[PDB]
Amino acid sequence: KVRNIVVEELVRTPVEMQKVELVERKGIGHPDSIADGIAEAVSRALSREYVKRYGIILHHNTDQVEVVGGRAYPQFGGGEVIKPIYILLSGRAVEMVDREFFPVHEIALKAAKDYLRKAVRHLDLEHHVIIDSRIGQGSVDLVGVFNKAKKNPIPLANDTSFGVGYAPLSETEKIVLETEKYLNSDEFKKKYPAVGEDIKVMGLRKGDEIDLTIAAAIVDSEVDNPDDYMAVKEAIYEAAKGIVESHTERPTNIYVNTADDPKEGIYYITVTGTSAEAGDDGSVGRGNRVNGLITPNRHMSMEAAAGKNPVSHVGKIYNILSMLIANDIAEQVEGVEEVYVRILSQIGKPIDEPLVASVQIIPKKGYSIDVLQKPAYEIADEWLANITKIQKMILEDKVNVF
Amino acid sequence: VRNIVVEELVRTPVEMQKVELVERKGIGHPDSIADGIAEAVSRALSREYVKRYGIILHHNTDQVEVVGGRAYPQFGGGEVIKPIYILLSGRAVEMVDREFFPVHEIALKAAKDYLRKAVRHLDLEHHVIIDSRIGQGSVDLVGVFNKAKKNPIPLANDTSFGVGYAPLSETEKIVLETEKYLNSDEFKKKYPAVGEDIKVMGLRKGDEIDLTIAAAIVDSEVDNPDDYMAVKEAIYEAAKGIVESHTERPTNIYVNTADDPKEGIYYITVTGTSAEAGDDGSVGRGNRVNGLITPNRHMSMEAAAGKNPVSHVGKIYNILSMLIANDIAEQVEGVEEVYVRILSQIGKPIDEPLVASVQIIPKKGYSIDVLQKPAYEIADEWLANITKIQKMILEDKVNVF
Amino acid sequence: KVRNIVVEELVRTPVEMQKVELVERKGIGHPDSIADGIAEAVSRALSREYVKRYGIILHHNTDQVEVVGGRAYPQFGGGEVIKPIYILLSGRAVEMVDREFFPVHEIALKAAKDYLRKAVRHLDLEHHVIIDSRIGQGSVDLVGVFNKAKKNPIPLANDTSFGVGYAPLSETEKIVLETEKYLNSDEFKKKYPAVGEDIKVMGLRKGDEIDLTIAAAIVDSEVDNPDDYMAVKEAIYEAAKGIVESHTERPTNIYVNTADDPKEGIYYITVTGTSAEAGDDGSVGRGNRVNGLITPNRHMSMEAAAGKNPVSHVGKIYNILSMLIANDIAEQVEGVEEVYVRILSQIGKPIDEPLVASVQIIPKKGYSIDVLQKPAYEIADEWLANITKIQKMILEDKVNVF
Amino acid sequence: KVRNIVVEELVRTPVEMQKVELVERKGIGHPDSIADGIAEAVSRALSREYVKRYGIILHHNTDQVEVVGGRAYPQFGGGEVIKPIYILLSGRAVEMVDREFFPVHEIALKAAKDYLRKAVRHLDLEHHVIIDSRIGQGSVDLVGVFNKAKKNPIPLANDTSFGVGYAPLSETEKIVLETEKYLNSDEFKKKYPAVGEDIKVMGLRKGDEIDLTIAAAIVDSEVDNPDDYMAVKEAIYEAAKGIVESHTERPTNIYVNTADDPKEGIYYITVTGTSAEAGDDGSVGRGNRVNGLITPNRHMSMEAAAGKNPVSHVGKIYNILSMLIANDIAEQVEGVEEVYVRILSQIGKPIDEPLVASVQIIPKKGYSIDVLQKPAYEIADEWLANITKIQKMILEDKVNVF
Structure with missing residues (x-):
C-alpha cells in the first residue's frame, strides 16, 4: 500500500x-493506575478466553473502571479499614455468541481480583474491597464475524482518533x-x-x-x-x-x-x-501514557489505551504503534536526536491505512533532515504493514499500556 | 515579587x-457529558456552601462514569430500551459542626439539570439513572475560617503544574x-x-x-x-x-x-x-481547559472538571495559564505564540510559584526585548489576583472543557 | 375434572x-409496603406491555425490591433529606423475544417512579431517591410460547407451594x-x-x-x-x-x-x-397478606404475592384464589360462621389441579357441617375451574395483593 | 415478682x-434461607465483636439481605457458572463509638462469606458470588449506652410487639x-x-x-x-x-x-x-419461622427474626421466647396434648412485664386443665424472668431463627 x-x-x-x-x-498502587491495570487485566483475560473458545478475540472495550475511595484509620503496628474500596467494572464485551452465553462477568471479576492481589499486596480482597461489574452486553453471530474478518484481513477503523509517542x-x-x-x-x-x-x-x-x-x-x-x-x-x-x-x-x-x-x-x-x-x-485514562510517563515537555494523545481491544481500537493500537515506531527510529537511524510520531485513523478504512502518520524529527548537529527522512519513512511503513502484531504482543504481556 | x-x-x-x-x-459526547456533570456538581455545591456559610467547603467531584444504555433507533422515532447509568463519586462535606448539608440532593439536581440542557431530547425521568457514591466529610467551621484567615492565598502542599498557550x-x-x-x-x-x-x-x-x-x-x-x-x-x-x-x-x-x-x-x-x-x-478523557485536544501543543494530564475551585492547585494553574497566555497574545503587539507554564512551591502560597515560565515566539521583525516587560506584567497581575479564578468559576465565566 | x-x-x-x-x-408509605407496591406495579406494567406487543403476558417475577433507608433531619416548617433512599428492583423478566429486545428496565423504573409519586406524595422522585434495576434477563421464542399455551390452556404449576385465605x-x-x-x-x-x-x-x-x-x-x-x-x-x-x-x-x-x-x-x-x-x-413479603392484614388469630401463607406473575405463579394466584373462595363461601352459604381455605400446587400439573384444596368451616350454632359441605365444595370447584380469571383481574386492578 | x-x-x-x-x-441452601442465614450471621458476628471491644452489644439491625440470582450452565460431569450471584447487605449498624471507629463492613463481609462457605459447599466464594454492602451508618456515646443499660437492665418496650409459639x-x-x-x-x-x-x-x-x-x-x-x-x-x-x-x-x-x-x-x-x-x-423473612417451619395449620407471626438486634428488638425476642416456653411446657408437664404461647409487650414497661402472656393448653384425654395450670405458669414465669438468657443463647449459637 x-x-x-x-x-x-x-x-x-x-x-x-x-x-x-x-x-x-x-505507580501501580496509585488509584488511577489501579483502574488502568484492572481495565487492561479484564481486556486481556477476556481476550485470552475468546481465543481459547473461538480462535479469535471478539469485540470488547473494558476501558471504564471506577475506583471509589473507602475510609480507613491507620496506626503504627496495624490500623483498620472502616469503609471498603468500591470498584465498578464497565465498558462492553460480547456475551451472546450465537445463542450461547460467554461468561464475561465471571472472567472480568476474577481478572480484577487477580490483578489487585499483585498490585496491592496488603489489600484484603474479600473484606476491604467490593468489586461489581456493569459491563455492557454485546452480541455476535460467529459466521458474520468470520465473514467480516475474511473480507478485511486488516481490521477497519471504528473511530476517528489519534495516537502519539516519541523517543528517546x-x-x-x-x-x-x-x-x-x-x-x-x-x-x-x-x-x-x-x-x-x-x-x-x-x-x-x-x-x-x-x-x-x-x-x-x-x-x-x-x-x-x-x-x-x-x-x-x-x-x-x-x-x-x-x-x-x-x-x-x-x-x-x-x-x-x-x-x-x-x-x-x-x-x-x-x-x-x-x-x-x-x-x-x-x-481509567487519568494517568500514565503508554510509555509509562506523564510528560508536558513532550506530546500526547488523550485516548486511554488501558482496557481497549487490541484488534480494532486505534486509541490503544496507535498509541502503542506510535511508541514502537518512534523507538525504532531513535534507535536505528543515526542522526536522530528526537522523534515524535502521530497517527490518525480513517474511519471504515483498514487500521494500516491511517489518514496520516506524521513523523517529526530533530536532527543531531551535523545531520540534515534530508538523510533522515527515507529511513524514518520505511520504519513507519513497515510497522504499519505489521500492525496486527500488536494483538499478540498484548496477549503475551510484551508491552505495557501505562 | x-x-x-x-x-x-x-x-x-x-x-x-x-x-x-x-x-x-462536543457537549453531548459521553466523555464531555461526564466532564460537564462533574463541574456542574462542583459549582452547585460551591454556590450552596457560600450561600449557607459564607465560604466554599472542601469537595472534589471529578469522578463521573457514564455507562451506555440500550436503544433501537428508527426513522420516524425510535425507543430507548435500557436507561443510561451514571455514577457520581468523589467526596464533599455534609457535616458542618452540628448541622447537615444535603450534598446528594444538590448533586442529583445539578447533574440532571446539566443533562437537560446538554442533551435536549433525552428524557431525564425515564432514559437515565443517576446514582451517587459521593464520599463523606465533616468540618468545624471556625477552624476553616481560621485557616482561610491565616492564609488568604492558599498554600501549596505539592509541586502541581499547569500549561496554556495562545493564540x-x-x-x-x-x-x-x-x-x-x-x-x-x-x-x-x-x-x-x-x-x-x-x-x-x-x-x-x-x-x-x-x-x-x-x-x-x-x-x-x-x-x-x-x-x-x-x-x-x-x-x-x-x-x-x-x-x-x-x-x-x-x-x-x-x-x-x-x-x-x-x-x-x-x-x-x-x-x-x-x-x-x-x-x-x-471524566478527564477529552477536551483540555481551552476546549480542545491538541497533540501539536503541550498539554497537561490534569482533569479540571469537578476539582475544588478554592484549593486544587492543578485546576487553578491550568485555568490561570490559559488566561495569561490569552491576554499576552491579545494585548502585546508582536506576539506570534506564547506558552505559560506554572509550577507550585510546596509550603508557599499559590501566587508564589516555584516558577512561571512565559515563552514567546516574536512575530517577524520584533525582538524579545520589546515583549518581555508587558508579558511579565500581565502574568504578575494574574498571579497577584489568583483568587479571582474561584469567582469566575462560580459566576460561570470560564470553561473547563 | x-x-x-x-x-x-x-x-x-x-x-x-x-x-x-x-x-x-x-399502610402504603410504610417501607415494607412500598416494596410490595413497587414489586406489583412493575409486574403489572410489564404484563400490560407484553399484552400490547404480543397478545399474552410473558414470563416474569419482580417480587424482589429492597428499600434501603436514607438519612434526613426533619424540623417544623420544613426539614431536609441528607442521604437519599435507595431502591433496588430485582427478580426476572423476559427481555429477549425472537432475538428482539423488550424494554424491561425502562418499563420497571418508570413504573416504580409512577407508583412512588402516588404512594409518598411529598417525596421528591428525582432528588430524594435513587432507583436502580438488576432485574434478570430471560429469553423466549414466541412460537414456542404460543405452542405451549395452545397445549396447556390452564398453565402448569412451576412450584410446590400454598396459598391461604379466610372469611369473613x-x-x-x-x-x-x-x-x-x-x-x-x-x-x-x-x-x-x-x-x-x-x-x-x-x-x-x-x-x-x-x-x-x-x-x-x-x-x-x-x-x-x-x-x-x-x-x-x-x-x-x-x-x-x-x-x-x-x-x-x-x-x-x-x-x-x-x-x-x-x-x-x-x-x-x-x-x-x-x-x-x-x-x-x-x-417484599414482610407485611400485609393479600387481604391487606397481618392477623395472627387466623392463618396465612408465607408466599409473597406482590410482583409474582398472575399466570403461573401459585404463590400469588393461590393466595388471591383462597381469599376469593373463602369470601364467596362466607357470603353465599348460610350457616358458615368462618371458613379457612388452603390450596397446595402440584408441580407440572395444571394450576386448577391442586394436590389439595382444603376447606375448613366453623358452622353457625344449629348448623351441621353436613349441610355446608356440598355448596362450599361447589364454590371452590367453580373458582378452580375459573382460575385464569385472576389474570385479567390483576391486569385491570380489580384485586389487591397487600 | x-x-x-x-x-x-x-x-x-x-x-x-x-x-x-x-x-x-x-433448607439451608435455598435462596430465602441463604438470605435469613446471612442476616443472622452478620448480626451475631457484629454482636460478638461489639462485646469484645466495648463489653456490650451496640445497636444494629441487619435483617435486610437480597440474593439476586446469577446465570449458570449446568451439565452432567461439571457445568459452568456464567454470571455471579449478587448479594446486597443492608440494614444499619454502629461504626463510630465516641472518637473511635468500628469496622462494620469488614465484619459483615467476612461473616456473610463465611456463612456461605458452610451453607453451599460447592459454591466458589471468590468467583461465583459478589457481596455488596449498604449497611447504614450510626454513632454512639458509650457512657450514654451504659447509663441507659444500667437504668433499665431489662429493656423497655416502646410499642405493642407480639410473638407466638406452639408445641409439641x-x-x-x-x-x-x-x-x-x-x-x-x-x-x-x-x-x-x-x-x-x-x-x-x-x-x-x-x-x-x-x-x-x-x-x-x-x-x-x-x-x-x-x-x-x-x-x-x-x-x-x-x-x-x-x-x-x-x-x-x-x-x-x-x-x-x-x-x-x-x-x-x-x-x-x-x-x-x-x-x-x-x-x-x-x-429475608420470606421463609421458615423460628421453629424451622412454615405451618399454615398453626398460628404464625409475620416477624422476620433473622438479623434483628438480639438485646432490644422485642418481636425477635418474644418469638424465640414463645417457642422455648411452649416447648418446655410440652416436654415437662404431664398431660399437655398441645400448647400455644402468645406474648404481647407493654409499651412503657420492661419486656419481662408483658401486657399479656397467654398460655393455652389442650389437655390429653382424661386430664383436667387445673392440674396443668400451675406447672405451666411456673415454666412461663421462669423464662420471662430469664429473658436476657436469649441474648447469650443467640451469641453462643444455641437457638435458631429459621
Whole structure:
C-alpha cells in the first residue's frame, strides 16, 4: 500500500537542553493506575478466553473502571479499614455468541481480583474491597464475524482518533520510570514489605539540577513506630540514589514523603498500601501514557489505551504503534536526536491505512533532515504493514499500556 | 515579587508546521457529558456552601462514569430500551459542626439539570439513572475560617503544574467554532434533528485542511434517509461558513463518514447522544481547559472538571495559564505564540510559584526585548489576583472543557 | 375434572368470641409496603406491555425490591433529606423475544417512579431517591410460547407451594383495614396534607374492649409548630372514631403517635411522609397478606404475592384464589360462621389441579357441617375451574395483593 | 415478682385430628434461607465483636439481605457458572463509638462469606458470588449506652410487639423438619456429596396418609450421567423413608424432584448446589419461622427474626421466647396434648412485664386443665424472668431463627 506517511523536521531545542523539564509517574498502587491495570487485566483475560473458545478475540472495550475511595484509620503496628474500596467494572464485551452465553462477568471479576492481589499486596480482597461489574452486553453471530474478518484481513477503523509517542527518553524520564519500577519490583518488595505500591514519582529538572520526589505509602502493619518508618524512608532514598547515579552526572536532591511532619504526628502510613483506602478515587485514562510517563515537555494523545481491544481500537493500537515506531527510529537511524510520531485513523478504512502518520524529527548537529527522512519513512511503513502484531504482543504481556 | 521568567521560544510556529491535528468533543459526547456533570456538581455545591456559610467547603467531584444504555433507533422515532447509568463519586462535606448539608440532593439536581440542557431530547425521568457514591466529610467551621484567615492565598502542599498557550491557530479555531455553532441555540432551532453528540477532527497538511464531523442525528426529527441527507447538508453548509471566516486554505468537510447507505447504516439516535447505546464516558478523557485536544501543543494530564475551585492547585494553574497566555497574545503587539507554564512551591502560597515560565515566539521583525516587560506584567497581575479564578468559576465565566 | 377438594369442620371458638385478638396493617408509605407496591406495579406494567406487543403476558417475577433507608433531619416548617433512599428492583423478566429486545428496565423504573409519586406524595422522585434495576434477563421464542399455551390452556404449576385465605372479617379487622385506607384516601389527603403515607394501624381487642393505635408520619412542611401538629393528630383521631363507630359497639381507646413526648421535643415528623427517609428499610413479603392484614388469630401463607406473575405463579394466584373462595363461601352459604381455605400446587400439573384444596368451616350454632359441605365444595370447584380469571383481574386492578 | 401470665384451656380439636395438614421447610441452601442465614450471621458476628471491644452489644439491625440470582450452565460431569450471584447487605449498624471507629463492613463481609462457605459447599466464594454492602451508618456515646443499660437492665418496650409459639410438633412437622435436617447433615453430605443444600420439603397429610415431596438441587460435578443422578435420588428417597418410619406408622408416599422429565432431558442439576446460581432470588423473612417451619395449620407471626438486634428488638425476642416456653411446657408437664404461647409487650414497661402472656393448653384425654395450670405458669414465669438468657443463647449459637 502507499500509506499517508509524512516526515518533517521539528525545529526546537531538544528536551535535554530545555531549561525546565517536568516528569511524573503514577505507580501501580496509585488509584488511577489501579483502574488502568484492572481495565487492561479484564481486556486481556477476556481476550485470552475468546481465543481459547473461538480462535479469535471478539469485540470488547473494558476501558471504564471506577475506583471509589473507602475510609480507613491507620496506626503504627496495624490500623483498620472502616469503609471498603468500591470498584465498578464497565465498558462492553460480547456475551451472546450465537445463542450461547460467554461468561464475561465471571472472567472480568476474577481478572480484577487477580490483578489487585499483585498490585496491592496488603489489600484484603474479600473484606476491604467490593468489586461489581456493569459491563455492557454485546452480541455476535460467529459466521458474520468470520465473514467480516475474511473480507478485511486488516481490521477497519471504528473511530476517528489519534495516537502519539516519541523517543528517546531523557535522563529525567529514565530516572522517574526506573525509580517507580524498582521500588515496586517483587525483588525490592521482599526486602521491605513496609513499602506500599502507591508510589508517585516526580522528577523536576532546572538546568543541570534535578529534584526527585517520591511519595510512597508505607504499610502500617509492617512498621511499629516512627523510627521503623524513618528507616523505611531511608531505604527508599538509597534505592533511588543508585538509579539516579546509574542515569545522570547531574546533581540531584531526593525527597521522600515531603508532607510528613514528626511534630504534629503526620506520617504517610496506610493499612493497605494504597491511598484508595482513605478516600482518593481513580478512573481509567487519568494517568500514565503508554510509555509509562506523564510528560508536558513532550506530546500526547488523550485516548486511554488501558482496557481497549487490541484488534480494532486505534486509541490503544496507535498509541502503542506510535511508541514502537518512534523507538525504532531513535534507535536505528543515526542522526536522530528526537522523534515524535502521530497517527490518525480513517474511519471504515483498514487500521494500516491511517489518514496520516506524521513523523517529526530533530536532527543531531551535523545531520540534515534530508538523510533522515527515507529511513524514518520505511520504519513507519513497515510497522504499519505489521500492525496486527500488536494483538499478540498484548496477549503475551510484551508491552505495557501505562 | 514573583519568579516569572519571560524568554524567547526558538521554534517554528505551529502554523508553519506541516501537519497539525486538533480534536473537540462536543457537549453531548459521553466523555464531555461526564466532564460537564462533574463541574456542574462542583459549582452547585460551591454556590450552596457560600450561600449557607459564607465560604466554599472542601469537595472534589471529578469522578463521573457514564455507562451506555440500550436503544433501537428508527426513522420516524425510535425507543430507548435500557436507561443510561451514571455514577457520581468523589467526596464533599455534609457535616458542618452540628448541622447537615444535603450534598446528594444538590448533586442529583445539578447533574440532571446539566443533562437537560446538554442533551435536549433525552428524557431525564425515564432514559437515565443517576446514582451517587459521593464520599463523606465533616468540618468545624471556625477552624476553616481560621485557616482561610491565616492564609488568604492558599498554600501549596505539592509541586502541581499547569500549561496554556495562545493564540489559537486557524485549524484550532475552525474545530472549536464548528462544534460550538453546531451546538448553538440558534442552530438547534433551525435544525433540531442535529443532536449534541458532535465530535470534530481537524487535520491540516501544509495548506490543505480536512475537517471531519460526527454528529448524532435524532430519529424523531428525520422521517427517512432523504430527510437525514438534507440534515447532513445543512451541517456541511454551517461548517463551510465557519471555515471560510477563518481560513483561505482549501478545506474538505466530511460529515458522518461511517454512514453506509446501501447497507442501511446511518448515524441516527433516539436521544441525540451515543451514551444511549454505542458509547461510555468518564471524566478527564477529552477536551483540555481551552476546549480542545491538541497533540501539536503541550498539554497537561490534569482533569479540571469537578476539582475544588478554592484549593486544587492543578485546576487553578491550568485555568490561570490559559488566561495569561490569552491576554499576552491579545494585548502585546508582536506576539506570534506564547506558552505559560506554572509550577507550585510546596509550603508557599499559590501566587508564589516555584516558577512561571512565559515563552514567546516574536512575530517577524520584533525582538524579545520589546515583549518581555508587558508579558511579565500581565502574568504578575494574574498571579497577584489568583483568587479571582474561584469567582469566575462560580459566576460561570470560564470553561473547563 | 375431579379435583382434590376436602371440606371438613374446624372445631374452635370463633374469632369474635376469642379473648385476645391482634390485627395490624402497614399502610402504603410504610417501607415494607412500598416494596410490595413497587414489586406489583412493575409486574403489572410489564404484563400490560407484553399484552400490547404480543397478545399474552410473558414470563416474569419482580417480587424482589429492597428499600434501603436514607438519612434526613426533619424540623417544623420544613426539614431536609441528607442521604437519599435507595431502591433496588430485582427478580426476572423476559427481555429477549425472537432475538428482539423488550424494554424491561425502562418499563420497571418508570413504573416504580409512577407508583412512588402516588404512594409518598411529598417525596421528591428525582432528588430524594435513587432507583436502580438488576432485574434478570430471560429469553423466549414466541412460537414456542404460543405452542405451549395452545397445549396447556390452564398453565402448569412451576412450584410446590400454598396459598391461604379466610372469611369473613371480624370487627377489629374491618376497623384496622378501613382506618388505614381512609387515612390514606385521596379525599382525606386533600383535607389534611400534613398526614404522611407511612401509617401503621394496630387493633388489639381484649374481650369487649378495643385499643386502636395509629402511627402516622406527619410531613414537616405542612405543620409549622407543635400545635399545628396536635391539630393534625386530633383530625386523625376523629377520623378513626367515625370508622370505629361505624363497625363496633365495643368501647374503644384510640391512640395516635404514642412515642410523642412534647416535653422532650419529640414528635413523629418527617420531611417526606415515610420513615424510609430516616433509615427504616423495606423488602417484599414482610407485611400485609393479600387481604391487606397481618392477623395472627387466623392463618396465612408465607408466599409473597406482590410482583409474582398472575399466570403461573401459585404463590400469588393461590393466595388471591383462597381469599376469593373463602369470601364467596362466607357470603353465599348460610350457616358458615368462618371458613379457612388452603390450596397446595402440584408441580407440572395444571394450576386448577391442586394436590389439595382444603376447606375448613366453623358452622353457625344449629348448623351441621353436613349441610355446608356440598355448596362450599361447589364454590371452590367453580373458582378452580375459573382460575385464569385472576389474570385479567390483576391486569385491570380489580384485586389487591397487600 | 408478678407477671400477667394467664393459663387457660384451648377448646379445640388437636392438629393430629384435623383431616388436612400442610407443612413446608426451606433448607439451608435455598435462596430465602441463604438470605435469613446471612442476616443472622452478620448480626451475631457484629454482636460478638461489639462485646469484645466495648463489653456490650451496640445497636444494629441487619435483617435486610437480597440474593439476586446469577446465570449458570449446568451439565452432567461439571457445568459452568456464567454470571455471579449478587448479594446486597443492608440494614444499619454502629461504626463510630465516641472518637473511635468500628469496622462494620469488614465484619459483615467476612461473616456473610463465611456463612456461605458452610451453607453451599460447592459454591466458589471468590468467583461465583459478589457481596455488596449498604449497611447504614450510626454513632454512639458509650457512657450514654451504659447509663441507659444500667437504668433499665431489662429493656423497655416502646410499642405493642407480639410473638407466638406452639408445641409439641406433629408427626408431619417432625418429618418435614428432620428430613431436611438429615439431608443437610455433615454425615449425609460426606456419603453423598452429589446432594446440594438447596432442599425444600413439603409434607401433606390427609387423614392417615402423608405425601412427602423433596426438591433437592443435585451437583453436576458429582454426577456423570442420568443413572448416577437417579442413584442419588434413590439415596434421598431412602434416607427420607428412614426419617419417616421413625416418626409415624401412617402410610406415606415419598417423591423426589418431581419436576424431572427424563424423556425430555430435564433433571434438577446444578453447578453449585443452590438454585440461586440460575436466576432464582432470595430475601429475608420470606421463609421458615423460628421453629424451622412454615405451618399454615398453626398460628404464625409475620416477624422476620433473622438479623434483628438480639438485646432490644422485642418481636425477635418474644418469638424465640414463645417457642422455648411452649416447648418446655410440652416436654415437662404431664398431660399437655398441645400448647400455644402468645406474648404481647407493654409499651412503657420492661419486656419481662408483658401486657399479656397467654398460655393455652389442650389437655390429653382424661386430664383436667387445673392440674396443668400451675406447672405451666411456673415454666412461663421462669423464662420471662430469664429473658436476657436469649441474648447469650443467640451469641453462643444455641437457638435458631429459621
